[PDB]
Amino acid sequence: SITEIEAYLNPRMGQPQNEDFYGFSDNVTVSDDFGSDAPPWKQFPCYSTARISLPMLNQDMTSDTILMWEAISCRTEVMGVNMLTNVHSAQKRVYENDREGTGIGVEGMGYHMFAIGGEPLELQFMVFNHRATYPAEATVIKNPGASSQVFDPNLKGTLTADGVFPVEAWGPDPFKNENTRYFGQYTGGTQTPPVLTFTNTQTTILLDENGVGPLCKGDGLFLSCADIVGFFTQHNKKMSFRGLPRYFRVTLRKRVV
Amino acid sequence: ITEIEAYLNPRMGQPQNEDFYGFSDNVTVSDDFGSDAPPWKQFPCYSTARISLPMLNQDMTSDTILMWEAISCRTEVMGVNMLTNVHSAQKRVYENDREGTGIGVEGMGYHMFAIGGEPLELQFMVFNHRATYPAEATVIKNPGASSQVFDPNLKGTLTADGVFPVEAWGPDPFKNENTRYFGQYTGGTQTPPVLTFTNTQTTILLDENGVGPLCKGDGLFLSCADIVGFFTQHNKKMSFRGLPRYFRVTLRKRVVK
Amino acid sequence: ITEIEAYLNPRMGQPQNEDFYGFSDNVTVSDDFGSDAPPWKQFPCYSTARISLPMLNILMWEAISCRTEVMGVNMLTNVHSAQKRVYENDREGTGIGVEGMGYHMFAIGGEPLELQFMVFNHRATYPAEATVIKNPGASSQVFDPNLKGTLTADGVFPVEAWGPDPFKNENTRYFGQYTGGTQTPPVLTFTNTQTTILLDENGVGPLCKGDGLFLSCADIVGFFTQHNKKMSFRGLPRYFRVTLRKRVV
Amino acid sequence: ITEIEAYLNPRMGQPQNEDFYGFSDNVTVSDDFGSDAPPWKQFPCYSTARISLPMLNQDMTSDTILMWEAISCRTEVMGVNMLTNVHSAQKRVYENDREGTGIGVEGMGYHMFAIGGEPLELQFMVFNHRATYPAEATVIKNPGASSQVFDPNLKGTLTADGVFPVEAWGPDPFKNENTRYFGQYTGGTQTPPVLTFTNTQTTILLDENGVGPLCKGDGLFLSCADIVGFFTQHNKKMSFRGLPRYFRVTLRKRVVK
Amino acid sequence: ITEIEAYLNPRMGQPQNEDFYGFSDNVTVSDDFGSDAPPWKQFPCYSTARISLPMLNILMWEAISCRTEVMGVNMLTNVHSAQKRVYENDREGTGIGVEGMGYHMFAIGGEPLELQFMVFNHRATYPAEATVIKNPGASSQVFDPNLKGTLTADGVFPVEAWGPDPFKNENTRYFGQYTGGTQTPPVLTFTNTQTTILLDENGVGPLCKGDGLFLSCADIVGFFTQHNKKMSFRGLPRYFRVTLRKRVVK
Ligand SMILES: CC(=O)N[C@H]1[C@H]([C@H](O)[C@H](O)CO)O[C@@](O[C@@H]2[C@@H](O)[C@H](O)O[C@H](CO)[C@@H]2O)(C(=O)O)C[C@@H]1O
Ligand SMILES: CC(=O)N[C@H]1[C@H]([C@H](O)[C@H](O)CO)O[C@@](O[C@@H]2[C@@H](O)[C@H](O)O[C@H](CO)[C@@H]2O)(C(=O)O)C[C@@H]1O
Ligand SMILES: CC(=O)N[C@H]1[C@H]([C@H](O)[C@H](O)CO)O[C@@](O)(C(=O)O)C[C@@H]1O
Ligand SMILES: [Mg+2]
Ligand SMILES: [Mg+2]
Ligand SMILES: [Mg+2]
Ligand SMILES: [Mg+2]
Ligand SMILES: [Mg+2]
Known part of the structure; x- marks a missing residue:
């Protein structure tokens, strides 16, 4: 009847896995104008995504009846919020002219998004500057045109790979x-000060208007996120994205479709 | 029950399918109220569309009249993801050191939407009545001092896209x-921009009498403005940045008195 | 069950039907509490109106619910009209727009709004045009039960x-x-979908004495800062919709 | 029901019926913790009152007694209106230009109220234990370093208006x-002060068991502190500003075992 | 039903009962990630206590609800105690008071709080007094399922x-x-009127193994800034009220 799955997604801020700056981007460089804009690889965050294999049910061949795992609810938490109490690790200081005070810590933009589905997350391409040339490592629509600065119904994608679709x-x-x-x-x-909450007591109902949760096509549960907590500012004023990992607990029930 | 989906692209000032689509031109500021004439492209206008619904009644004088009734909607600001861009030709956090991220989009948020069975009815009201609007804009000309506050004579309806100044x-x-x-x-x-997006939020459009908007001429009228803030260049010139809006409107055919 | 719709224009200080309607005159600041005299037009006053209801007067019109909206929020997207620039040293950027204090209050009643007099500085000399308690004394800086009024006139009771x-x-x-x-950034919302019930703990709305509905408000949105750094209050008008029913009293 | 209405004037430091009633004296700041001595009038104290309720004439020897039960209250901070004053001898927004409004009251907000059937019970706790409070103030003298956090020995009751330092x-x-x-x-x-006022908000005072405060000796105990922020003079001297608090308490006669 | 009331004092870094109890030592900042070594007393640690409940034996104590309050919020109205002044150039104005980061967490359970190790900089060398995973590797900058602990001691697990x-x-x-x-302006509320239900989705509260009720918290309120611009963590104590019932388990 009911199964819980738990998973994590590590952030993909730009710097490679299992090297000293895992969880961070490379230092951000800023172009002089829109026509000379080509953000280098490692300097910008990409979406995290994973497909969790569920117990065989939809692909069970003992019945012609179509059964699917239905995600009825979830808990999700940003993990590692504790680490942002660090104001000593090589941070620009509050009173930099006097070489005094705490580090300024992680500050600036927060972008927190998650998706839970029974198939890959469907994407709309949209950019601040259409003339930005994204690097070879990134999955983008090349030469997307001025219409990609707002909504263009031709410019679609699917989140099919971890750490390569730019946020x-x-x-x-x-x-x-x-x-x-x-x-x-x-x-x-x-x-901007980051504002994060964490608890193991908060449940999000995933049922739609008709009382139906995401239905797991091919016995796959699709988890996606981006958790930009803000910027790390070094003593030399170089700034990098810092990200945090996301926990998922999804409650599923067997459903006759 | 029929569901329609539509988008409204922003009308921040720069023309469609040119390089600054989604932005205004750089804002110029007048010395005084007497000599205040904002050039076309430097200010946002409302977005609007009439969606053609399936044609119902052969004749509007009939004993039984069917109309499409909007009973609920979902609406999302799209492209919030693009505001994670702090590399595209933005004034830097530490401009004196030529260092840090771009400051990104900051400043005023103006977010409004409307769903109706006829054009949005408008009140004319301006900061400075002596402002001279350009030929492209729809305004009340020489509105007088009263137009700085409420004047019951100064009415309009949102009958055209991209020309009614916000x-x-x-x-x-x-x-x-x-x-x-x-x-x-x-x-x-x-000001830091704050934007949320989800495909899970429904707004009921029924009034206190249990009646939704009724679509006159089988037209559904969608209106919005979504100013997310200002783009600041290295030379400190500032432009409005806007985002497109998604609408999902649930309609039922209603017999109407 | 009748519906009343009304507007109250703001009374920020500058006269009606003239170029600065909706604004105060530029704010001057005293050197001390003793010499403090805010000139007429440099401070906002309460807006008020009595709406005449259909003759009734035993029966009374009972206000059961209302909608209220701050109108003209749209005008605050104006950052071109003679405003101090974001980068004033560089003579560049947008205007800073309207910024600073927001004071938003409304009242709906069956008689004039009852007032408590209370001032920041009791020694302030208000102008002859303003309705105040003159020489109110030091107790007027906090609560003094002797210092009462009623909001009987539009544009003269200082906020x-x-x-x-x-x-x-x-x-x-x-x-x-x-x-x-x-x-401070102004924060304003508007909708035609929000209703406030005016019934008290016993299920009774305001009862309109003499068939009068009393509307009051103040809507200070913030300050307008000119290039020369002179600052004035900017206000917005308020919409009222009041649903009343005939009640036997 | 029986309704009681009362006010508590603030006790910010400056004496009643003199020109600075509602204000503290200008705040001085110690050079170090060891020599810290906040002078009388430079810091706010709690406001408190006992209201005599109608006598119930109860045999405190018998099995059944009547007590006044506080079932609900309305409370309002009064005089919020006065904070629209930016002309009264305040540091100006553009002090270098001798131009702009006063900066008005800004900084810390501390708003607390208590409604009880006996005096408010207090825990002593200070930022700096080596502070020497003036003779006029009720404190625990030489409290020790444990007073900077929770010390179960350091108790008090709020038995006097205007002398217990907040x-x-x-x-x-x-x-x-x-x-x-x-x-x-x-x-x-x-910090900008944020205050709301309305005559329409009721707070229920019943506990988990459906019982409100029970008024011992037919006494209703009201306590508050309403620091709205600081008044800053042209010469940059800063003082606390407080506002009075309104109480409306609804009481019923309760049969108590 | 039975009620437990308890307090946890903060562990901001400075030793208990000395003049700076409730504060950290002044925070020093490394030049780089490789040489990063936060000295003992300059960083906050978790507070924890085990409450020994009355012997029951089978029955277990079940925590069904709680109230919790941050105590001493009143003390933050102090702007006179050796604080950097608002107008330091004029040597005038109040102290700036406590400003900056708020970290508020509490945990109520029937066994020790289970922890995930995760650090801003994996190359930070923690002092001997602290309980950490040593040389934890680059993976510890994000989630690594190998890096686990339990909150077994007060004032030694770095926040x-x-x-x-x-x-x-x-x-x-x-x-x-x-x-x-x-x-950042600190924002704190306190009341004795707010109850949190501790029952899970099946109507079961934490069950107190070996009749032990486990309370954990950290309450960083912000930074104290001295005239000389040295900055320290300031923390506040937390009150717990836990409502328990006897539950038949076996
Ligand atoms: C709120 C207030 O008291 N405003 C004063 C105003 C300000 O005090 C002044 O602008 C700050 O420098 O001053 C007013 O004019 C004053 C004259 O009446 C007085 O004779 O001379 C004063 C200078 O010593 C000052 O010019 C004003 O600007 O209107 C009076 C107003 O009440
Ligand atoms: C909070 C506190 O300890 N306040 C002191 C205050 C401050 O220490 C002082 O303003 C910081 O400069 O000092 C007070 O007494 C002063 C003497 O300490 C000083 O030597 O002489 C001053 C007169 O020039 C002054 O009298 C004060 O300002 O009142 C005492 C107070 O407790
Ligand atoms: C977090 C950190 O690594 N702090 C280290 C600091 C800072 O590097 C310097 O104070 C910056 O100049 O230097 C020490 O000599 C010190 O002052 O005790 C050792 C300490 O381990
Ligand atoms: Mg588990
Ligand atoms: Mg099957
Ligand atoms: Mg669809
Ligand atoms: Mg109407
Ligand atoms: Mg107790």
Whole structure:
């Protein structure tokens, strides 16, 4: 009847896994104008995503009856919020002219989004500057045209790979995702204090208007997120994205479809 | 029950399918109220569309009249993901050191949408009545001192896309019996933008009598403005940045008295 | 069950039908409490109106619910009209727009709003045009039960001298929010979908004495800062829709 | 029901019926913790009153007695209107230009109130234990370093108006079984004050068991502190400003075992 | 029903009962990640206690609800005690008071709080007094399922190195809020009227194994800034009220 799965998604802020700056981007470089804009690889965050294999049910061959895992609810937590109490690790100081005070810690933009679905997250391509040339490592629509600075119904994608779809080029497509629930919050600024909450007591119902949760096609549960907590500012004023990992607990029930 | 999905692209000032689509031109500021003539492209206008619904009645004088009734909607600001871009030609956090991220989009948020069975009914109201609007804009000319506050003579309806200045027109609470409108303004120029998005939020459009907007001429009228803040260049020139809005409207065929 | 719709224009200080309607005159600041004399037009006053209801008067019109909206929020997207620039040294950027304190209050009642006199500085000399308690004394800086008024005139009771009296107003509902500061971003919402019930703990709405519906408000949105750094209050008008029913009293 | 209405004037430091009633004296700041001595009038104290309720004439020897039960209250901060004053001898926004409004009251908000059937029970706790409070103030003298956090030995009761320093005493959560208290602190020195007022908000005072405060000796105990922020003079001297608080308490006669 | 009331004092770094109890030592900042070594007393640690409940034996104590309050919020109205002044150039104005980051977390359970190790900089060398995973590797900058602990001691698990483990804690409820920055206005509320239900989705509260009730918290209120601009963590104590019932388990 009921199964719980638990999973994590580590952030993909830009710096490679299992090296000293895992969880961070490379230092951000800023172009002089829109026509000379080519953000280098490692300097911008990408979406995290994973497909969790569920116990065989939809692909069970003992019945012609179609059964699917239905995600009825979830808990999700940003993990490692504790680490942001660190104001000693090589941070620009509050009173930098006097070489005094705490580090300024992680400050600036928060972008927190997650999606839970029975198929890959469907994406709309949309960029601040269409003339940005994304690097070879990134999955983007090349030469997308001026229409990609707002909504263009031709510019679609699917979140099919971890750590390569730039956050700044792709977002959830509200014209699709009938079998996914997604949630996002953006708080801008470069000196904004991060605001994060964590608890193991908060449940999100995933049922739609008709009382139906995401249905897991091919016995796959699709988890996606981005958790930009803000910027790390070094003594030399170089700034990098810092990300945190996301916990998922999804409650599923066997459903006759 | 029929569901329609639609988008409204922002009309921040720069023309469609040119390099600054989604932005205004750089804002110039007048020395005084007497010599205040904002050039075309430097200010945002409302977005609006009439969606053609399936044609119902052969004749509007009939003993039984069918109309499409909007009973609920979902709406999302799209492209919030793009505001994670702090590399595209933005004034830097530490401009004196030529270092840090771009400051990103900051400042005023103006977010409003309306769903109705006829054009949005507007009240004309301006900061400075002596402002001279350009030929491209729809405004009340020589509105007089009274137009700085409420004057019951200064009415209009949102009959055209991309030409009614946001700073000159607002929703008329004396009218709009057949439209639901919702707005939030956060002011300032360095204010952090706060935006949320989800495919899970439904707004019921039924009034206190249990009646939704009724679509006159089988037209569904969608209106919005989504100013997310200002883009600041290295040379400190500032432009409005806007985002497109998604609408999902659930309609039922209703017999109407 | 009849519906009334009304507007109250703001009374920020500058005269009606002239170029600065909706604004105060530029704010001057005293050197000390003793010499403090805010000139007429440099401070906002309460807006009020009595709406005449259909003759009834035993029966009385009972206000059961209302909608209220701050109108013209749209105009605050104007950052071009003679405003101090974001980068004033560089002579560049948008205007800073309207910023600073927000004071939003409305009242709906069956008689004039009952007021408590209370001032920041008791030694302030208000102008002849303003309705105040003259020489109110030091007790007027906090609560003094002797210092009462009623909001009987539009555009003359200073906001900074009079507030709603919680010891009275048994036949009025009032609601207020203050956000201070001089650089604070204004935050305003508008919708035609929000209804406030005016029934009290016993299921009785304001009862309209003499078939009068009394509307009051103040809507300070913030300050307008000119290039020369002179600052004025900016206000917005308020919409009221009040649903009344005939009640046997 | 029986309704009681009362006010508590603030006790910010400056004496009643003199020109600075509602204000503290200008705040001085110690060079170090060891020599810290906040002078009388430079810091706020709690306001408190006992209201005599109608006598119930009860045999305190018998099995059944009547007590006044506080079932609900309305409370309002009064005089919020006065904070629209930016002309009264305030540091100007553009002090270098001798131009702009006064900066008005800004900085810390501390709003607390208590309603009980006996005096408010206090826990002594201070920022700096080596502070020497003046003779006029009720404190625990030489409290020791444990007074900077929780020390179960350091108790008090709020038995006098205007002499218990807000900065040395708070509500004791280990007691106060017969009192309801509510507090909010917003810190900073340039923080915008945020206050609401309405005659339409009721707070229920019944506990988990459906019992409100029971008025011992037919006495209703009201306590508050309402620091709205600081007044800053042209010469940058800063003082606390407080506002008075209104109480409306609904009481019923209760049969008590 | 039985009620427990208890307090936990903060562990901001300075030793108990000395003049700076409730504060950290002044925070020093490394030049780089490789040489990063936060000295003992300059960082906050978790507070924890085990409450020994009355012997029952089978029955177990079940925590069904709680109230919790941050105590001493009143003290933050102090702007006179050796604080950097608002107008330091004029040597005038109040103290700036406590400003900056708020980290508020509490946990109530029937066994020790289960922890996930996670650090800003894996190359930080923690002092001997602290309980950490030594040389934890680059993976410890994000989630590594190998890097686990349990909150077994008061005032030694660094806040910046351990957080509640969402993959465990089936028998504990935990709640946290972080507001960052260094000049942020602190926002704190207190009341004796707010109850939190501790029952899970099946109507079962934490069950107290070996009749032990486990309380854990951290309450960083912000930074104290001296005239000389040296900055220290300031913390506040937390009150717990836990409502318990006897439950037949076997
Ligand atoms: C709120 C207030 O008291 N405003 C004063 C105003 C200010 O005090 C002044 O602008 C600050 O420098 O001053 C006013 O004019 C004053 C004259 O009446 C007086 O004779 O001379 C004063 C200078 O010594 C000052 O010019 C004003 O600007 O209107 C009076 C107003 O009440
Ligand atoms: C909070 C506190 O300890 N306040 C002191 C105050 C401050 O220490 C002082 O303002 C910081 O400069 O000092 C007070 O007494 C002063 C003497 O300490 C000083 O030597 O002489 C001053 C007169 O020039 C002054 O009298 C004060 O300012 O009142 C005493 C207070 O407790
Ligand atoms: C977090 C950290 O690594 N702090 C180290 C600091 C800082 O590097 C310097 O104070 C910056 O100049 O230097 C020490 O000599 C010190 O002052 O005790 C050793 C300490 O371990
Ligand atoms: Mg099958
Ligand atoms: Mg669709
Ligand atoms: Mg109407
Ligand atoms: Mg107790
Ligand atoms: Mg588990």
